[PDB]
Amino acid sequence: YSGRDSLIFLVDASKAMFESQSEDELTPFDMSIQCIQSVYISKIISSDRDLLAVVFYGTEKDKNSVNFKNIYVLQELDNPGAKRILELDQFKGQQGQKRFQDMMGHGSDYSLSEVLWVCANLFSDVQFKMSHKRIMLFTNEDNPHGNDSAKASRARTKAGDLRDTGIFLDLMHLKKPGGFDISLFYRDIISSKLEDLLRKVRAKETRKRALSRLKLKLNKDIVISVGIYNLVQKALKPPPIKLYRETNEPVKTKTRTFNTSTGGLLLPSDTKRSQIYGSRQIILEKEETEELKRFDDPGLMLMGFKPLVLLKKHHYLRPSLFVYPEESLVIGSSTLFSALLIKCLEKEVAALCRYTPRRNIPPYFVALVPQEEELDDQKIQVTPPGFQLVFLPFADDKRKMPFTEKIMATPEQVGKMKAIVEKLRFTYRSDSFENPVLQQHFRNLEALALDLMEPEQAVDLTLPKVEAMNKRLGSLVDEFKELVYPPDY
Amino acid sequence: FLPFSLGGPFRLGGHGPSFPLKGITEQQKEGLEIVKMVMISLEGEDGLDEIYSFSESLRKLCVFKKIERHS
DNA sequence: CATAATAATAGTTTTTAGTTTATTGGG
DNA sequence: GCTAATAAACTAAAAACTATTATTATGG
């Protein structure tokens, strides 16, 4: 399943968007530009399968497809790009505001129905599948309808039209944040995020589709259609793209085998695999090697049920995954699987199976820990019920350790470090850390793509502090440290 | 090592529980007695870990024991 | 052995298993 | 007293979803 998400930015530009607004800081325009720039950066680092656009209502020099009055379109629906970032940042700050005034002006008449018209036209413009559409609109007007009520009625009609079409609009306080003083009129049929958007959290990708719809074969007769769903993947930087120094042109890389004996070229068919063992040069075929890697057909042949005691923390392998029934070519799988899942309190004994994720690969035995339905009171189902794909290590997977033995230590040190670690308690949060390398790489990209003077070095929570935990624990860490002759040299 | 197997008894084509031992050559019984009276006091650290048996060696590359060097 | 047809084949993208760089390592 | 089992890329990754074009079972 693919589909592009769209978010369109609409901001007032007539008179109240370039004012102090009962403040001494910058006009709403400046940090509105900052916020939309932040969401541009977040989207760029997040996903490139989405389109964004910017339109201003209130216009002295109109430019749009339908050529209405007081309607100006800057950037249409398109994937965000560095040139878009430059275009947006050209109109940031006071210098950006005055440049905008020089090339755009201010002080026209809003026409909300025309805005809805042009935004609907923009949505019609894209030829891609629209998974989701969203409109945001920020202005200092809680009710800009002191003008003719005909315009208000037409705007309401167009809002109903776009709601029927599936378009949703967003507006929130800008003039007087807080107090529920905004949307005096828009509260009828239209339903703070400033910090959330300004936080511009990035370096997060998004899942598009699952994988590996496999069969649970309990026997040679009955099968169950299920799909293995990932939940964690080791993220990494996008692969480098080979380019030409002079022209920054993509390079048609062309790798091939060759022979210096005759200067000709070898086909992938006449090049045979070879091995060396003992006193012989073992020769093999590529297809023979592939068959050697092949053991049986992909599937999940149930092997039995093993009590949830053989699993040990020190016995671990490649990450476990999630299993969900998928009734696309076998029906009745979902109901039976659900019946199995709910009966887990008695089914503490974990299911045993040998796993063949894909074709022509050796199978690994994998236990199936029944996942639970951890529904939240906020109606959020975290980790829906299923099975854990815990991999069982083989006999050859264990490396022998020295058999040095140590006897129990004194309990007074045990108690003193018990107090130490109890005082030094850290509330673990699963989503509380990001890889410094990847986020730093993203900072470099966003930096060395604009005309940025120097890069920003985002502070990570991974780096241990020097004294914050020490003061959180006090000096008792050294006061209680009564070990004789510390191993320090 | 006895020519026969030593030691889910029948999961898939297993060995018999036991075989007659009074019908074998008396010399073989004497040799088994001699080797066992020498061996009960000394078997080997590998045997303490796991004994190379007649059937386990045959089934798998038990003596091969693929493993890497010290980490 | 024809033509308002019809569909069961293909084709673009996600993510794992392949191999080179480099650092503790003696007779 | 000169030969490391390290793990950054090695190298080109058996993947589906959502998009169109060739067969026909048949009107003739």
From Swiss-Prot, chain A:
Residues forming coiled coils: none
UniProt-reported outcome of changing residue 133 to A: Abolishes adduct formation
Origin superkingdom: Eukaryota
Any one of the GO BP annotations: negative regulation of DNA-templated transcription
Modified residues (Phosphoserine): 20, 261, 432, 475
GO CC, one annotated term: nucleoplasm
Compartment(s) of residence: Nucleus; Chromosome; Cytoplasm
A GO molecular-function annotation: ATP-dependent activity, acting on DNA
Keywords assigned: Acetylation, Activator, ADP-ribosylation, ATP-binding, Chromosome, Cytoplasm, DNA damage, DNA recombination, DNA repair, DNA-binding, Helicase, Host-virus interaction, Hydrolase, Immunity, Innate immunity, Isopeptide bond, Lyase, Methylation, Multifunctional enzyme, Nucleotide-binding, Nucleus, Phosphoprotein, Systemic lupus erythematosus, Transcription, Transcription regulation, Ubl conjugation
Residue positions, PTM N6-acetyllysine: 272, 286, 293, 416
UniProt modified residues of type Phosphothreonine: 410
EC number: 3.6.4.-, 4.2.99.-
Cross-link (Glycyl lysine isopeptide (Lys-Gly) (interchain with G-Cter in SUMO2)): 242, 272
Region (DNA-binding): 232-296
Residue ranges occupied by any Ku domain in the UniProt entry: 216-423
Ion transport in keyword set: no
Miscellaneous remark of the record: Individuals with systemic lupus erythematosus (SLE) and related disorders produce extremely large amounts of autoantibodies to XRCC5 and XRCC6. Existence of a major autoantigenic epitope or epitopes on the C-terminal 190 amino acids of XRCC6 containing the leucine repeat. The majority of autoantibodies to XRCC6 in most sera from patients with SLE seem to be reactive with this region.
Subunit structure, as described in the record: Forms a heterodimer with XRCC5/Ku80; heterodimerization stabilizes XRCC5 protein. Component of the core long-range non-homologous end joining (NHEJ) complex (also named DNA-PK complex) composed of PRKDC, LIG4, XRCC4, XRCC6/Ku70, XRCC5/Ku86 and NHEJ1/XLF. Additional component of the NHEJ complex includes PAXX. Following autophosphorylation, PRKDC dissociates from DNA, leading to formation of the short-range NHEJ complex, composed of LIG4, XRCC4, XRCC6/Ku70, XRCC5/Ku86 and NHEJ1/XLF.
Family: Belongs to the ku70 family.
Role description: Single-stranded DNA-dependent ATP-dependent helicase that plays a key role in DNA non-homologous end joining (NHEJ) by recruiting DNA-PK to DNA. Required for double-strand break repair and V(D)J recombination. Also has a role in chromosome translocation. Has a role in chromosome translocation. The DNA helicase II complex binds preferentially to fork-like ends of double-stranded DNA in a cell cycle-dependent manner. It works in the 3'-5' direction.
Name this polypeptide is given: X-ray repair cross-complementing protein 6
Organism whose genome encodes this protein: Homo sapiens (Human)
Boundaries of the shown chain within the full protein: 32 to 534 of 609
UniProtKB/Swiss-Prot annotation, chain B:
Domain of life: Eukaryota
Cross-link (Glycyl lysine isopeptide (Lys-Gly) (interchain with G-Cter in SUMO2)): 22
Coiled coil: none
PTM annotation, UniProt: ADP-ribosylated by PARP3. Phosphorylated on serine residues. Phosphorylation by PRKDC may enhance helicase activity.
Induction comment from the UniProt entry of this chain: In osteoblasts, by FGF2.
Localization per Swiss-Prot or TrEMBL: Nucleus; Nucleus, Nucleolus; Chromosome
Leftover remarks: Individuals with systemic lupus erythematosus (SLE) and related disorders produce extremely large amounts of autoantibodies to XRCC6 and XRCC5.
Similarity-based family: Belongs to the ku80 family.
The protein's role, per its UniProt record: Single-stranded DNA-dependent ATP-dependent helicase that plays a key role in DNA non-homologous end joining (NHEJ) by recruiting DNA-PK to DNA. Required for double-strand break repair and V(D)J recombination. Also has a role in chromosome translocation. The DNA helicase II complex binds preferentially to fork-like ends of double-stranded DNA in a cell cycle-dependent manner. It works in the 3'-5' direction. During NHEJ, the XRCC5-XRRC6 dimer performs the recognition step: it recognizes and binds to the broken ends of the DNA and protects them from further resection.
Domain topic, free-text comment: The EEXXXDDL motif is required for the interaction with catalytic subunit PRKDC and its recruitment to sites of DNA damage. The VWFA domain interacts with the KBM (Ku-binding motif) found in a number of DNA repair proteins.
Subunit annotation: Heterodimer composed of XRCC5/Ku80 and XRCC6/Ku70; heterodimerization stabilizes XRCC5 protein. Component of the core long-range non-homologous end joining (NHEJ) complex (also named DNA-PK complex) composed of PRKDC, LIG4, XRCC4, XRCC6/Ku70, XRCC5/Ku86 and NHEJ1/XLF. Additional component of the NHEJ complex includes PAXX. Following autophosphorylation, PRKDC dissociates from DNA, leading to formation of the short-range NHEJ complex, composed of LIG4, XRCC4, XRCC6/Ku70, XRCC5/Ku86 and NHEJ1/XLF.
The protein, known as: X-ray repair cross-complementing protein 5
Organism: Homo sapiens (Human)
Gene that this sequence comes from: XRCC5
Range covered out of full length: 164 to 244 of 732
